[PDB]
Design a protein around this ligand. Structure first.
Ligand SMILES: Cc1n[nH]c2ccc(F)c(Oc3cc(C#N)cc(C#N)c3)c12
Lengths: 415, 545
């Protein structure tokens, strides 16, 4: 077994995580205790004594598509304190091409980690507790011996063994983009779908040869990731209310889009006219109206991804199963604004939906910038905290604040 | 004894090293006592004599001190505590009576000399040294170091625990039918086994601890029900809060209102009904524990209902993991809600209450969900499962509101329960403009230094008004403006503001507020019959804006 541990070092002065554990259902506690008594006979983890002051939270998800309980460790914290190690020393590079593929496939390769082993000295940072109910039993405390799934140091370590794994496949199909982000490998190609699907089956065996099984995706197509112009409505008979409402949208986009103008139409609004009252459009305004319309489907202009900077994501509830989204680094400076819409069943589940859009958007940043965003989630903390897993399925977790949508911001973006 | 259990490897916080604190000299008297105390302790393996070598020292003291005439050794672990590493708080919450499974037979075992019966990591004894000084600190003191968990020391709680966890392990394993609540230095065993294999299963549990260093009580000593535990009264088939008594005082001090408000939330847990909003409003000092404060009529009015509620006993049932939990909430008055969790109609596992989000622009629809929320969290905590929700709200009311609101809002499982007051929205802003309704284009402003704002409206029917304001804010003026338009508009009005602020506030149908300007506007709005409200960038054309 003996493969030299990669001496992992926390950041200078920064201390290990001491994150509280969330009270869990007894269903996931049971399922964890199992997933965990199995992982220890495989020597993957080891109980730890109170002599350990650290703690990362843990939870139980339900295997995207393949429903059967999976452990999910929340290492966001440890990952921040570990940030020099993964991001800097052993940083894994973002293919610019991945966002352009006719198709991209996500494969989970976190079972790869279990094999390779963890720096005897780093393993304390990795402790987690498996709660009881009503505090009879104390927590079943554990700690890792082999790169964890969820900790970003791992892919950064394994990088060298992954390039070996893919070297013949990469050699044989040099136009296939492989990009590994955490526990997933992103596989992109311009192949036809059946060829793609095939290239990914082949790629799957190569993996199996090392122990990374699954007897694909999310099947993504970044190629077809087109916009959402802020979208103004098509002319006719405009009331005062509607002029007042476009001058509003246009005002706001003017803040993001350059060639914007609203003086032509704003003109008509110097009044004390009743808003049901109709008003003719002095042509010069159909000119202003249109000039903007053209712009609206055309890439802000001076907005560029700055790698030094965090990503931010806002999400609006639009009702009707719709939700919209903006991804930017500096407020108003949108680098990406799509929209996720309801796929029924849990027809009336507002959380079921927010949780899916947070993963759709997280996925796409991962494919566009190779990083996840910080969500401004139009929801109440506790509610999210309580229910965010009953529907969660990604192996990672991005960062989140809880916000309060401005009534008009939900508006402009309304499609 | 001194458990054979492994030791847990204790270390010092990093940039550190053992404390080296000086022994102020001691009274001949206390010196003699420390010396007797230490001698027995030593004879029991609890401590051990030491070299002049060991540099460390944490001071000793000895207190009697009244109805005692027998004293005890007190150790200042204060410094040693600022240098001992950090430990795991392995008990994130303490058992609530309402989650204690309803167990046939229950046994209570309190370990004797708990920290003293557990080894302390060899390489660490060294740091725990104290010194019994010689009469005038003349000679050199007698020096010791612990072999066990010092009382008062940092990691004793943490360590005594792992130590008992491990011991209890292979017992539970070969005895899963058996429930061992490990609290502090107690062991609460319960099972549905009958005094038969029960008081015989318990003497087996015991036997295991002794084989392992831990003394406990015989059936002759093991206490019996009700167990007056941690503020509660536990019988085998029902629990309640421990005996509450509201003071027959004529003149209430801030302090004594606080204790009332405390006891009042304690009882709160099983005594459905309890209100505390009116006595809590009084709690807004000043300060002064000894400050006697006058009770509002509303207060004397609460305390009285509470006095009634607590007339006679209310007890609560225990849990059955096979039956569902039903949670029912009710509207006790403004931002005042109650619930009760039961499994069988009306035999209550437990009660509780919920008071506003300081109710700072909110409506009952928002308040219920905060309660359903708080309640959802407690069941997870307590029972490992959410309950079924019976709410004084209508299915359509909930959906009209949820569908329309910008925050993802999500109640799990519920049913209407026609138990007035039912929860309702008090008015609704229109979706489209009222044709044939006056458009007040409202406005408002404030001067920062002066702090003098104006507030007016100007209509499409040519009207106007321009009220003048004092000691005001840009916010406060944009709402007084909207207030004005509501006052002089009648039944159906359109109102165009430049205030994202107010729009925002009104749009979420508040039906209560901390601000009375906001309160006026609520009183309006409900009166009207049609109110479309709309927004415009200010400093733009927008005449009226
Ligand atoms: C162990 C038990 N299982 N069910 C149950 C019902 C009632 C009751 F009393 C009790 O024991 C106790 C539990 C705790 C706890 N937690 C505390 C005490 C005490 N004293 C006793 C139990």
């Amino acid at each position: 077994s003996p493969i030299e541990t990669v001496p992992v070092k926390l950041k200078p002065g920064m201390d290990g995580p001491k994150v509280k554990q969330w009270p869990l259902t007894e269903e996931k506690i049971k399922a964890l205790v199992e997933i965990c008594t199995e992982m220890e006979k495989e020597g993957k983890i080891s109980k730890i004594g109170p002599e350990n002051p650290y703690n990362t939270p843990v939870f139980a998800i339900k295997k995207k598509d393949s429903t059967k309980w999976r452990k999910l460790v929340d290492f966001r914290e440890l990952n921040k304190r570990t940030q020099d190690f993964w991001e800097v020393q052993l940083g894994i590079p973002h293919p610019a091409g991945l966002k352009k593929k006719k198709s991209v496939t996500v494969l989970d390769v976190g079972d790869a980690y279990f094999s390779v082993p963890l720096d005897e000295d780093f393993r304390k940072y990795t402790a987690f507790t498996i709660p009881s109910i009503n505090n009879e039993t104390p927590g079943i405390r554990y700690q890792y011996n082999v790169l964890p799934q969820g900790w970003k140091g791992s892919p950064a370590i394994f990088q060298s063994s992954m390039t070996k794994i893919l070297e013949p496949f990469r050699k044989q199909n040099p136009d296939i983009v492989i990009y590994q982000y955490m526990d997933d490998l992103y596989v992109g190609s311009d192949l036809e779908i059946g060829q793609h699907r095939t290239k990914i089956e082949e790629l799957r065996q190569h993996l199996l040869r090392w122990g990374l099984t699954t007897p694909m995706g999310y099947e993504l197509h970044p190629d077809k990731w087109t916009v959402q112009p802020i979208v103004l409505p098509e002319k006719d008979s405009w009331t005062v209310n509607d002029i007042q409402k476009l001058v509003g949208k246009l005002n706001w986009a003017s803040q993001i889009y350059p060639g914007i103008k609203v003086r032509q139409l704003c003109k008509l609004l110097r009044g004390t006219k009743a808003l049901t009252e109709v008003i003719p459009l002095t042509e010069e305004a159909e000119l202003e109206l249109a000039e903007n319309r053209e712009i609206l489907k055309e890439p802000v202009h001076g907005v560029y991804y700055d790698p030094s900077k965090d990503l931010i994501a806002e999400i609006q509830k639009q009702g009707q199963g719709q939700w919209t989204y903006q991804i930017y680094q500096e407020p108003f400076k949108n680098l990406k604004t799509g929209k996720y819409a309801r796929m029924r069943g849990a027809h009336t589940n507002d959380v079921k939906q927010l949780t899916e859009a947070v993963q759709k958007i997280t996925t796409e940043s991962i494919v566009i910038w190779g990083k996840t965003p910080k969500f401004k989630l139009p929801i109440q903390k506790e509610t999210w905290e309580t229910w965010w897993t009953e529907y969660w399925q990604a192996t990672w977790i991005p960062e989140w604040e809880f916000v309060n949508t401005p009534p008009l911001v939900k508006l402009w973006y309304q499609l």
